[PDB]
Each structure stands twice: as C-alpha cells, then as structure tokens.
Amino acid sequence: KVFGRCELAAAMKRHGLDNYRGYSLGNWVCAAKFESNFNTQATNRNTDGSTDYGILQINSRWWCNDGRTPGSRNLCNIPCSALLSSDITASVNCAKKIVSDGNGMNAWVAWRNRCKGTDVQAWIRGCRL
Ligand SMILES: [Cl-]
C-alpha cells in the first residue's frame, strides 16, 4: 500500500523509530519518501544482481534473503518477501539492525543525498504524534 506522510510518521513512532540510534523521526519519514515514495511494494533491481525491497528499500545482498542474490548474507534473517507487506513491522525491525551496524542512515542513498543536511523535522510537521 501507499502510506500518507503522517500516517507513516505515526506508524514509525509506534514502532520505536523516533530518535533511534540518534535519528529523529523526520529522518525516517524523509528516507521513505525518497526511497519508495511511501509504497510498501517498491522494488529496485541492482547491477550486482541484488534487489531493494519495500518502503525502506532493504537490499538482498546483505540484509534479507530473496533466493536469487549471489553473496547474500541475510543479516536481518528474513525472506525479502516479508518486506513487501502492507504492515511495516518486518521492515522496521530490519531497519533497526541496518542502522546499528555502525554506519547509521548512510545505508540509504536517497536519505544521504536528499534528506541529510536539510530540516527533516519538517517531514512530521502537521501530524498528531
Ligand atoms: Cl523472498
């Protein structure tokens, strides 16, 4: 499904992402906007044979196993199919692991290039959280 901005903000806050590992909620909402345009079903194929899945575009080479990616490490220990659900729990749980591995939100290029450096709290402005 396609989430609305405040709708996603509320779901992410309920899932403990606000200020997780030092990243305020706005960062996560901004990343999702530019990574998948708030669509839980977005997929992107990469040159290395990997694919990015879901609202947070989680990669199959390191994080989830999709069964067609060479050198897959499955660090979140979940099939990539689970990250295409309308429910964001699995994606969020994996996202928490990705940010904890020691490089914060730099794993997400859309966040890195289009969110970082801007006023990200503007992404949750107007929402009841
Ligand atoms: Cl899969």
**How far apart, in Å, are the Cα atoms of 32 and each of 9, 18, 48, 67, 125?**
10, 14, 23, 25, 16
Helices 5-14, 25-36: crossing angle, 10 deg rounding? 130
CB atoms under 10 Å from CB of 74, counted, come to 16
Residue 17 three-state SS: coil
Residue 37 three-state SS: coil
Ligand 1: centre distance to CA 22 (Å):
30
At how many Å resolution was this determined? 1.7
Experimental method: X-ray
Whole-number Å distance between alpha carbons of 33 and 119: 15
Give the 3-state DSSP-derived string for 50-119, with helices as H, strands as E and coil as C. CEEECCCCEECCCCCECCCCCCCCCCCCCEHHHHHCCCCHHHHHHHHHHHHCCCHHHHCHHHHHHCCCCC
Q: What is the DSSP letter of 24?
A: -
For tokens 């403990």, the residue is 16
The verdict on whether 52 is a catalytic residue reads: yes
Residue 35 three-state SS: helix
- Return the H-helix or E-strand segment holding 43: strand 43-45
Ligand 1: centre distance to CA 122 (Å):
34
Domain ranges of the chain: 1-129
The verdict on whether 7 is a catalytic residue reads: no
Structure tokens at 112: 């890195």
CB atoms under 10 Å from CB of 46, counted, come to 12
Query: Of the listed 52, 66, 87, 119, which one is catalytic?
Result: 52
Quickly name the fold that domain 1-129 has.
Lysozyme (1.10.530)
